[model samples]
Target chain A: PKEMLRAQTNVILLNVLKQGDNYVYGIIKQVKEASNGEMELNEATLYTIFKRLEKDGIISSYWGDESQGGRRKYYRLTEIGHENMRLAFESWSRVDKIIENLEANKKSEAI
Target chain B: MAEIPKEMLRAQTNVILLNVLKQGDNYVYGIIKQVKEASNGEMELNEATLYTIFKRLEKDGIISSYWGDEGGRRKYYRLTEIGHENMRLAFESWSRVDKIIENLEANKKSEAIK
Candidate 1:
């Protein structure tokens, strides 16, 4: 994946957290379906990112019921994760505003 | 302004590079300056990162490079036909996400007030 999508890994993870507790594969499936196949991700890569988020306390994981199938690890956003998401969205807001201004200027220049 | 993350910079490298080239044929340093100005000084890329992006673009045939000695020995870059098409696609992709993010921000703000 390109750096653009890669940089959004955390934000995407936080969004998926809104769906409640989910295993890694489930999250991957949700993201793929949401992005219309534009945001492809590998399980191994997601595992690494999820582990990092868990270690940072932005997310927490617990073992799921193994009665239905093999043990599955479920992840959900913690308090820190919610805070981080707010901050990230704000940062993106600034970037988007700047780009909009720049694009407007370009349009004016062309006219 | 908050420091832009390296990951974000890396992600935007191609789009920004192509945008700069769209202005005119430019060398590496020139393209870097253009990016800084266009982004309103919010982003600054390192030499290595710029070169890596240039190399990737050239290899992918989205851009072509040539040697120039107008000042000192330098490599100049220009977008190819494919590059123009790619830039259009990138802009479209960016706008789509921009709208979605803006909507999310609005929702967040409304929730906060409520």
Candidate 2:
């Protein structure tokens, strides 16, 4: 998982968690809205991410009300999640700057 | 920007999609299975996203897929040198994030006690 991917993940997860605790379906809807359709997340991909993050201790889950949906497991951002977001942003910023530097230097080298 | 927090596991996905063929050759279902197990049956990959990733990986020469021998003629993916490079990059990038998250959490807890 590179910073780019992790950053993207953190971005969507943060947005969802920021909305407060939510289930998978809710998060997916939220992601679609927040990313403006940039992330049309499917179930497999979304749940895999959710489970892995949970294993990583960045998030926690609980069985929530099913009337709105089905037997949904609501996920919440942990303190580690906030830290993960910060680290992701920092890592991505470094990578982004490096990429920009390389692009800028490419012209110099070409000449 | 849907920056999902650390609670979400996308490693298997990037692993399956980006390095689907790195470990072994497989059909679409195999890749999907790998993704599922990796995510603990959490990821229910859709046809579109999975195929799109396959296309992107193929385009970048990260991985290439072909019709399988099975009846449905499933698609299979294999990693290329570019895929290896991406995997390496992914590993390097993830290591740093993991360390930072670990440290920050410990520090935050320490601060909150005061």
Tell me the spans in candidate 2 whose CA falls farther than 4 Å from its real position. Answer: A1-11, A35-39, A66-72, A107-111, B1-114
Q: Compare the candidates by DockQ and give the number of the best one.
A: 1
Regions of model 1 farther than 4 Å from truth:
A1-11, A28-42, A66-71, A97-111, B1-5, B39-49, B67-74, B87-114
DockQ of each: 0.18, 0.03
RMSD of 2: 15.0
Residues B29-71, model 2: lDDT tens digits: 6666655554446655776777766776688777876677654
Worst 10 residues of 2 chain B by lDDT: B1-10
TM-score of the second chain for every model: 0.64, 0.60
lDDT per residue, candidate 1, B20-110, as tens digits? Answer: 6776788888766655766778777787987888788788898998898854699888999998897777668656555544544455567
With a 3 Å backbone cut-off (N, CA, C), the pairs that clash in candidate 1 are none
Q: How much is B20 displaced in model 1, in angstroms?
A: 2.2
**CA lDDT, every model vs. true structure:** 0.69, 0.61
The alpha-carbon lDDT assigned to residue A98 of candidate 1 equals: 48
lDDT of 1 at B23: 66
